[PDB]
């Protein structure tokens, strides 16, 4: 039995062997003695086409403004597929909504929509607002370049007072993000993380919770996500931290090494039926951390340098909103790649390689993908140099008794053996186990 990489571990420092997990994530199961399996992420299909440019943010609340959607395609605002106006700003888009009023921030200005028209919100001193949030009946706006944050009127976001502001005393530099945790605001600056709580006093509505700050400030705007009564944020050292009694670095050495090579990082949310993926997106990667299994994985899109689905299921190049359905990425090819290997203290002959996986589940009876092809390649020098791809079939529809066997391979030595498996068919795929030199029995499979 070979142990596969349960999490994406690609550490280029030290030339350590890499175990990349592409479009596959570990999920606990009860039907297997091992208890865990590798399952494929669902493909992306077009839920709706809105706008022309990249989607900067999608907002959808059933109880807000009749449940209509709000999408910031490029620099315009669209509601129910109808353009409302032009939005100025180049940063990440933040939404803050109440029963009848919606506020949109793009990095420099605040815009208000109440179901009638879109109007620019007059801000004190005409300053730029990094992002806008809502908490305990108030609207919180972070002024760009300063450590002071303003709060609007009670259930009113179009009236901002110059004296209605509070300053993060312990932070001598500008704030960058806000997260509403436990109904209270949490401020992420470049140097510290501050906890504030509502007071119920109209004069001073929010007060800072003393003796609790984290010196690992946020890296940039939009790098904090609130999940499961906690939050995950990218620190100033390009390290992902989770909120606890003392913050813990949930990102291993490989994740931090990959992040350090990227200039822009964005932390957002991906939702599967029971899986919550904290997705960190860089220039050329998009790595998702699953909190249910506490494990990292990598999402990739075929033919592109980065995953198509961005924050809020928005395409990063076109105006397509994506949703998880089927196993075809935009009707194309979905790639699932993983590695299984072992370290050997001496010579080891490999006669069979069995891949206990799912078979005979193809929805296509004819065509190119009637018999899907899964390829394997072997390496002895810790994955540095690889052999040719040898491909087998997962069996046609109904061939549930299919053996995924790659038998007769040669000798492996001190560095160890590493086999890479890749599947590029738009059908379901699940990996249960990988074994070497199994028993040869059978019954007319």
């Amino acid at each position: 039995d070979l142990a596969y990489g349960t999490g994406a571990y690609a550490r280029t420092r030290g030339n350590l062997p890499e175990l990349p997990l592409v479009n596959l994530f570990v999920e606990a199961t009860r039907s297997d003695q091992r208890g865990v399996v590798l399952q494929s992420r669902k493909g992306l299909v077009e839920d709706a086409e809105v706008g022309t440019g990249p989607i900067r943010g999608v907002f959808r609340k059933d109880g807000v403004l009749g449940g209509a959607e709000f999408v910031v395609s490029d620099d315009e605002l669209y509601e129910d597929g109808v353009s409302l106006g032009t939005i100025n700003g180049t940063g990440p888009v933040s939404f803050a909504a109440i029963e009848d009023e919606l506020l949109v921030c793009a990095g420099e200005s605040i815009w208000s929509y109440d179901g009638t028209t879109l109007d620019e919100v007059t801000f004190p001193d005409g300053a730029d607002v990094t992002k806008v949030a809502y908490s305990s009946g108030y609207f919180i706006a972070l002024r760009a370049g300063t450590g002071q944050w303003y709060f609007s009127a009670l259930y009113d976001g179009t009236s901002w007072d110059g004296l209605d502001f509070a300053t993060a005393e312990s932070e001598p530099d500008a704030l960058l993000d806000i997260v509403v945790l436990d109904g209270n605001p949490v401020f992420f600056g470049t140097q510290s993380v501050e906890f504030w709580s509502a007071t119920g006093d109209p004069d001073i509505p929010f007060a800072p919770i003393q003796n609790r700050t984290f010196e690992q400030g946020i890296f940039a705007t939009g790098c904090a996500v609130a999940i499961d009564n906690s939050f995950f944020w990218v620190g100033a050292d390009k390290i992902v931290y989770r909120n606890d009694a003392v913050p813990v670095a949930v990102a291993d050495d490989g994740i931090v090494e990959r992040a350090t090579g990227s200039t822009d990082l964005r932390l957002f949310l991906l939702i599967d039926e029971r899986h919550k993926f904290v997705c960190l997106r860089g220039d050329t990667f998009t790595m998702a951390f699953d909190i249910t299994t506490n494990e990292w994985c990598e999402f990739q899109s075929y033919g592109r340098t980065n995953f198509r689905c961005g924050p809020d299921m928005g395409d990063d190049e076109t105006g397509i909103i994506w949703r998880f359905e089927g196993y075809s990425d935009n009707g194309g090819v979905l790639e699932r790649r993983f590695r299984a290997g072992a370290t050997l203290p001496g010579p080891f002959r490999v006669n069979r390689l069995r891949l206990i996986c799912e078979v005979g589940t193809t929805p296509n009876l004819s065509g190119e993908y009637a018999d899907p092809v899964i390829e394997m390649r072997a390496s002895d020098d810790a994955g540095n140099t690889w052999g040719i791809w040898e491909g087998e079939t997962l069996g046609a529809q109904g061939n549930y008794r299919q053996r995924v066997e790659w038998r007769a391979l040669g000798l492996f030595d001190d560095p160890g053996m590493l086999f890479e498996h890749r599947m590029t068919a738009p059908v379901s795929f699940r990996v249960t186990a990988v074994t070497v030199n199994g028993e040869l029995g059978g019954r007319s499979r």
Partner: protein
Amino acid sequence: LRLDRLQRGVPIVDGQGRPNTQYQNLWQRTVKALEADSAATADILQELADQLALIV
């Protein structure tokens, strides 16, 4: 200045039962407010005795 409430997910006690810095300082603030307010009440009583006679 304002007396803070206890957070749901923040532990006020360590592993061995000792109180952490945050809870210790919160208790210090609460007790200091107690002493200050009691002193204010005593001053109110004393000056009320002074002024109960003043107006009469």
